[PDB]
Design a protein around this ligand. Structure first.
Ligand SMILES: O=C(O)CNC(=O)C(=O)O
Ligand SMILES: [Mg+2]
Ligand code: NI
Ligand SMILES: [Zn+2]
Length: 331
């Protein structure tokens, strides 16, 4: 069995290997990359996402989100308070202000220490979930707006034609902006490209051990667990590495820098934070190996998780027994 300790693997494809996306995902899995839940892909030196980032300041962040925490430093939730619209140039200036900028630090480890010590005492503003793409249309390799769609994959594997679309999302971050512990919708893969700016630190639980994280989360968030049998789908709960280690939960960590891709694998729980002003692009995707995970994915039906249009068909075809309850949660 490849990668039996479930370590995060880092890949350096050549320009030739970078042509066929599906083939390279399958290669990484042949080497055991999925056992970690997360892999890093460093593009060949010949490749670029676009020519420059000099002209992005007029993109609008219609609904910036202020991430307000409650709890203790290592075990907290966050809620998202909506703020007035602002452009990417305005948000960049805000991120760089004395109130929000990255503090002086020695290295990524010192900054990680400062994040976990101090996150709860601040409320950073995240420009998340913005439909769009920063890949040039002429970038042919690993262009996250040109991937095979999940609807087409389901149709190829299972024969059923379904409605829905699959487009990328932009994320504009600042120091301390936070992504809570989650798996993807329907336990899909994700791919994330850090286009520019400061790093993103990731934490991940191997898919084979995801239920250990869920059991800890039910202990640590007992009111939320009574409210919903899949409350991590709400994407609000944070647990620090120190608390994970105290409770014996297997996990790994890695820092993504600008110019790098990360892939999350089906049922790989992940969480993390941004180091300073940055911009990422991410999208969900599927492979044949996903189908079995999609069929078994948990679902939130309490009303909180509320998701895209395209998840309807995935539930309806892969999980017909759960469909009626889940759809009630959507309405
Ligand atoms: O970058 C972020 O805020 C969150 N991204 C992801 O959870 C992802 O790419 O799957
Ligand atoms: Mg612009
Ligand atoms: Ni994710
Ligand atoms: Zn719920």
């Amino acid at each position: 069995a490849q990668n039996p300790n479930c370590n995060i693997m880092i890949f350096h494809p050549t320009k030739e290997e970078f042509n066929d996306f599906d083939k390279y995902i399958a290669y990484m899995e042949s080497q055991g990359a999925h056992r970690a839940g997360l892999a890093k892909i460093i593009p060949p030196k010949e490749w670029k996402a676009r020519e420059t980032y000099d002209n992005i300041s007029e993109i609008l962040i219609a609904t910036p989100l202020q991430q307000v925490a409650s709890g203790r430093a290592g075990v907290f939730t966050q809620y998202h308070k909506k703020k007035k619209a602002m452009t990417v140039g305005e948000y960049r200036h805000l991120a760089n202000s004395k109130k929000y900028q990255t503090p002086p630090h020695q290295n990524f480890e010192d900054l990680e220490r400062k994040y976990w010590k101090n996150r709860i005492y601040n409320s950073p503003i995240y420009g998340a979930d913005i439909s769009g793409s920063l890949f040039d249309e002429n970038t042919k390799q690993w262009n996250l707006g040109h991937l095979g769609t999940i609807q087409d994959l389901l149709e190829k594997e299972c024969g059923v034609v379904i409605e829905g679309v699959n487009t990328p999302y932009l994320y504009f971050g600042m120091w301390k902006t936070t992504f809570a512990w989650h798996t993807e919708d329907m336990d899909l893969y994700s791919i994330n490209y850090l286009h520019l700016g400061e790093p993103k630190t990731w934490y991940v639980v191997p898919p084979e051990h995801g239920q250990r994280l869920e059991r800890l989360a039910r202990e640590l968030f007992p009111g939320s667990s009574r409210g919903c049998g899949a409350f991590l789908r709400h994407k609000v709960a944070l647990i620090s590495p120190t608390v994970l280690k105290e409770n014996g939960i297997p996990f790994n960590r890695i820092t993504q820098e600008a110019g790098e891709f990360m892939v999350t694998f089906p049922y790989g729980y992940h969480a993390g934070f941004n180091h300073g002003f940055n911009c990422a692009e991410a999208i969900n995707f599927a492979t044949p190996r996903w189908i079995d995970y999609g069929k078994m994915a948990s679902q939130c039906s309490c009303g909180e998780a509320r998701v895209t249009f395209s998840m309807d068909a995935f539930v309806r075809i892969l999980q017909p027994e759960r469909y009626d309850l889940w759809k009630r949660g959507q309405d």
